[PDB]
Tab-separated table of C-alpha atoms and ligand atoms in Angstrom:
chain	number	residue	atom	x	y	z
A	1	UNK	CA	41.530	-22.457	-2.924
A	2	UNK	CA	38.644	-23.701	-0.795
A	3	UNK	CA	39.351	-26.188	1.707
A	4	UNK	CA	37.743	-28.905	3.143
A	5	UNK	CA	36.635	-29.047	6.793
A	6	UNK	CA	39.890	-31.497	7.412
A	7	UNK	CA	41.979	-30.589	5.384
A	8	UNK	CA	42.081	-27.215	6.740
A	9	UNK	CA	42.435	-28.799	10.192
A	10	UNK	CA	45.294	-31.369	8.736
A	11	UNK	CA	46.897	-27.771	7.292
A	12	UNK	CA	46.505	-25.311	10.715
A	13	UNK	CA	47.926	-28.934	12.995
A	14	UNK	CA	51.010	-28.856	10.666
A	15	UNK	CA	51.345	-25.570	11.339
A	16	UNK	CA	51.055	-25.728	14.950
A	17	UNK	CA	47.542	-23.601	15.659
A	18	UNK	CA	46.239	-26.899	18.179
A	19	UNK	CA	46.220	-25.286	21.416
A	20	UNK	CA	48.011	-22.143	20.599
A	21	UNK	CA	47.830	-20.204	23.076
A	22	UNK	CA	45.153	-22.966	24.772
A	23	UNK	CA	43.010	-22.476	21.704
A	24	UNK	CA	42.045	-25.947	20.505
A	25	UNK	CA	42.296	-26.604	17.075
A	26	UNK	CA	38.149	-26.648	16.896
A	27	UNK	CA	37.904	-22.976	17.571
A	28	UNK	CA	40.646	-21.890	14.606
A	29	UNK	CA	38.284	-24.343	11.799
A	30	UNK	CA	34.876	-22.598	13.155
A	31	UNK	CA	36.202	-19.359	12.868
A	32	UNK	CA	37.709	-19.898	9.396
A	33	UNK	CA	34.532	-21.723	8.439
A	34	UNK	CA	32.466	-18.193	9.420
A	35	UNK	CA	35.177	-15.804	8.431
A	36	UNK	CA	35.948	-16.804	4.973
A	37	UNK	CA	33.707	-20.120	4.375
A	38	UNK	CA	37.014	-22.059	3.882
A	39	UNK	CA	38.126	-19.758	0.858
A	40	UNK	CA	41.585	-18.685	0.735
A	41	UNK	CA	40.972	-15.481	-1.832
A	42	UNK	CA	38.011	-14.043	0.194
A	43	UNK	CA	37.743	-10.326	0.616
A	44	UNK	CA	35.718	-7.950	2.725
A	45	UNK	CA	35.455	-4.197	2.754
A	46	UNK	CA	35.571	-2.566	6.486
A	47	UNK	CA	33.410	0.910	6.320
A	48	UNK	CA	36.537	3.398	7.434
A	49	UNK	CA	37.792	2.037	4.015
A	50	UNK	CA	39.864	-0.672	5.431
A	51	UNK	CA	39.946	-4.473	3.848
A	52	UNK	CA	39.639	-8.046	5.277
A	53	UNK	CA	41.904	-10.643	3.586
A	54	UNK	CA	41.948	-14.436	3.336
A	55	UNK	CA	40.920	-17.462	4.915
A	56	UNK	CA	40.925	-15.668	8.450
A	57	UNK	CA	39.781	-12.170	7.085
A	58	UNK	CA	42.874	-10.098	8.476
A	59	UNK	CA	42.747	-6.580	9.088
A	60	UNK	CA	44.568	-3.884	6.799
A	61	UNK	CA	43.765	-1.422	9.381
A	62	UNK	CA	46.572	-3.014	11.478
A	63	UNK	CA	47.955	-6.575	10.395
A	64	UNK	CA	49.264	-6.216	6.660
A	65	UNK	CA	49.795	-3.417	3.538
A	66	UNK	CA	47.316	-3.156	1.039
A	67	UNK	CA	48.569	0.196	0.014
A	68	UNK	CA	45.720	1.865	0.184
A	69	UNK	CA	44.648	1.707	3.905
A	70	UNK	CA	46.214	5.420	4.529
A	71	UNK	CA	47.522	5.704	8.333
A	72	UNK	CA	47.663	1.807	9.049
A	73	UNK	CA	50.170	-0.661	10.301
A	74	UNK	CA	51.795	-3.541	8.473
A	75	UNK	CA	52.531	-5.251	12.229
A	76	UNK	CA	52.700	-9.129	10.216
A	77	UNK	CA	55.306	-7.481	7.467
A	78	UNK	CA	53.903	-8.558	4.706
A	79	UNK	CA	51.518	-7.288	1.588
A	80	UNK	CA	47.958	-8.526	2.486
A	81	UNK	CA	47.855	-10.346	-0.878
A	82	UNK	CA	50.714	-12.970	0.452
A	83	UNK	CA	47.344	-14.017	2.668
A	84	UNK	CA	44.868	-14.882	0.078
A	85	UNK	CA	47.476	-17.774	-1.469
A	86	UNK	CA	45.979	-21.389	-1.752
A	87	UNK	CA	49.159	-22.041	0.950
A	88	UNK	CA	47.713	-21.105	3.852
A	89	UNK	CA	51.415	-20.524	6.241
A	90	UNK	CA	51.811	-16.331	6.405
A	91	UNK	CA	48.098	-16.053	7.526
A	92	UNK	CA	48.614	-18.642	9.843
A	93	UNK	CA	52.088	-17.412	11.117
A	94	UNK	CA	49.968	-13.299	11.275
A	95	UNK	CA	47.446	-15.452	13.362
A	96	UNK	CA	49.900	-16.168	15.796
A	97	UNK	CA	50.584	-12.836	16.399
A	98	UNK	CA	47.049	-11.387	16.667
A	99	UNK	CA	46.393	-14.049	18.985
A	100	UNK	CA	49.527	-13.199	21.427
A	101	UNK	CA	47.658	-9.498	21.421
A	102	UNK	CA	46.024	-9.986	24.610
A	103	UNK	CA	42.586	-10.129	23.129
A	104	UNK	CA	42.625	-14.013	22.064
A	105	UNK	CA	40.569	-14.724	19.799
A	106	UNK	CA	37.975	-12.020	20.444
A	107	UNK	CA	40.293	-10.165	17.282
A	108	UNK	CA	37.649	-12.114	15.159
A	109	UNK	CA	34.431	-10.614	15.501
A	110	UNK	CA	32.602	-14.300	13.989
A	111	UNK	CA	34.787	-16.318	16.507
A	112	UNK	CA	32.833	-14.184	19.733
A	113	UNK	CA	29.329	-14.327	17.963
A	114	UNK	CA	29.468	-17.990	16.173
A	115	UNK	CA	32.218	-20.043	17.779
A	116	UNK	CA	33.022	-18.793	21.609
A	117	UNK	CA	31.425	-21.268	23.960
A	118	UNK	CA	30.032	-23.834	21.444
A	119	UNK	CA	31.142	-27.506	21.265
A	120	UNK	CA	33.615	-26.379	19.086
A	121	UNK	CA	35.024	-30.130	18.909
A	122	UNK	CA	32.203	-31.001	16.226
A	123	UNK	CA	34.218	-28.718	13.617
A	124	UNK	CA	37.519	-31.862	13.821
A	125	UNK	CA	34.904	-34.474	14.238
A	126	UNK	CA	35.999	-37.578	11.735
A	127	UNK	CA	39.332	-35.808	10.356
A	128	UNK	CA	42.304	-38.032	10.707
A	129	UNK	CA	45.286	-35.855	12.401
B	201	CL	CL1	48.410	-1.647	6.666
């Protein structure tokens, strides 16, 4: 499914990403909106083999099993495929936890580059929430 720029943010409120973690919900919508381009069945191939899943692009490497990311960590416990659904609550609830890392939001590389000290308000601008 690809979501609209307020309906996502309707979704991720529900779901209790506004200010998790003192993350407003603005920065969570930009970096879905650079990550995945709102689409919940996007997939990206990391070069150490590696795979990116879903509407936040999480990480094989570390986050969920693929089965076929040899040597990697499945610290969300659950198959990466459970994150490319049209229902959007495992990657949101794996979000949390990447979040709670100590890195922030710095885990997503588009985030840093695109989102990260921009008036990150515009991206819930006219959404009803
Ligand atoms: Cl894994």
């Amino acid at each position: 499914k690809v979501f609209g720029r307020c309906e996502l943010a309707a979704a991720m409120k529900r779901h209790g990403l506004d200010n998790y973690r003192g993350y407003s919900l603005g920065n969570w919508v930009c970096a879905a909106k650079f990550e995945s381009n709102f689409n919940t069945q996007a997939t990206n191939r990391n070069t150490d083999g590696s795979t990116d899943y879903g509407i936040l692009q999480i990480n094989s490497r570390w986050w969920c099993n693929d089965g076929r990311t040899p040597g990697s960590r499945n610290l969300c416990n659950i198959p990466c495929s459970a994150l490319l659904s049209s229902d959007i609550t495992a990657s949101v609830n794996c979000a949390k936890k990447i979040v709670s890392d100590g890195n922030g939001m710095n885990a997503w590389v588009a985030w840093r580059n695109r989102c990260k000290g921009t008036d990150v308000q515009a991206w819930i601008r006219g959404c009803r929430l």
